[PDB]
Amino acid sequence: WMPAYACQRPTPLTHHNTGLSEALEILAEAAGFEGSEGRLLTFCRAASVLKALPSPVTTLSQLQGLPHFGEHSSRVVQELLEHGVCEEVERVRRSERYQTMKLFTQIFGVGVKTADRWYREGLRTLDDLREQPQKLTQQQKAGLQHHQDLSTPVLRSDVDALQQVVEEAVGQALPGATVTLTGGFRRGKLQGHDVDFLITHPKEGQEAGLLPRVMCRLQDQGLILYHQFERSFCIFRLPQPGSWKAVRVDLVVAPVSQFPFALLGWTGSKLFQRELRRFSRKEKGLWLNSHGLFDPEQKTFFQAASEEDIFRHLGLEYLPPEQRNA
DNA sequence: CGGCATACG
DNA sequence: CGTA
DNA sequence: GCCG
């Protein structure tokens, strides 16, 4: 059948129900904009279920028995199957509230709470925000200045270039340290909104203090347009033909003992990790995050040398990153 | 009905 | 509050 | 919104 947790089934990047999943994810997004995290989760999970199916849904009957499809999500699918559009979805798409909250929350440094307050205050455009910078954090000023570049898809060419310069700085910061590409590109995506890198060292403990040294070295190369420890949310200056563009890059450091858990978490998808942690706690009684896996009965952490170890600890069939596109 | 992942900056 |  |  179809299991109820996304981490129990392979989900490929491309699939056979793209239009149906896209529509449900509009409703999930809108639910988030209104603070309804429960409805967001259900709509996300229902969309993910369709991603995992082996063929296109053609008839409403094919939804019977599928987890996370109830009256609401099935009606969305029925309208799409019958009319090619779902009236609720189209109403969301063209609502001023949805459009403005999408524009605002996609600014680096702006979340749902900030976007909602700005919306209530009457603000609607990026130029509205730029007219009174005094109301902005340093992070939001950077997100607004570079917003256009940050809206341009990051390509694989860009990733190769960025990894080499990151490796150069990491190599000077700490000989022997390694750089691993994570995030959506590791799941096989050809584009991204940013690049994610996970940094470690084979000798436990030697990675301590590493990220400041890396950042200082990238800074003195003039590559850091913005940055603010274990996680650095940066904007890199990336060369382009006769120019350059700003690119969001995340750098994260973990000791080798935690590296499998950090690799798993930063490789995503977001829904996959939420479902994996939910499964861990509620089905296995184990607590999972990007640092480790904790047995609260025996008060001990599971040692893992690989992602494969973690799936085994959780009694789940192993899924390569390419099949974690929940 | 309660739950809905779980961290760091 | 923001970030992943 | 859906599940157990």
Ligand SMILES: Nc1nc2c([nH]c(=O)n2[C@H]2C[C@H](O)[C@@H](COP(=O)(O)OP(=O)(O)OP(=O)(O)O)O2)c(=O)[nH]1
């Ligand atoms: N954006 C985000 N990522 C999260 C969260 N929680 C969590 O574990 N992650 C993990 C799973 C994500 O796939 C991974 C990388 O984050 P990301 O925003 O760069 O997403 P991504 O690489 O998959 O896709 P892209 O939008 O960057 O192209 O971090 C969260 O709340 N937000």
Ligand SMILES: [Mn+2]
């Ligand atoms: Mn409804």
Ligand SMILES: [Mn+2]
């Ligand atoms: Mn009809």
Ligand SMILES: [Mn+2]
């Ligand atoms: Mn990413």
Ligand SMILES: [Mn+2]
């Ligand atoms: Mn993104």
Ligand SMILES: [Mn+2]
């Ligand atoms: Mn830590």
Ligand SMILES: [Mn+2]
């Ligand atoms: Mn990222």
Ligand SMILES: [Mn+2]
């Ligand atoms: Mn309730």
Ligand SMILES: [Mn+2]
């Ligand atoms: Mn509800």
Ligand code: NA
């Ligand atoms: Na944002």
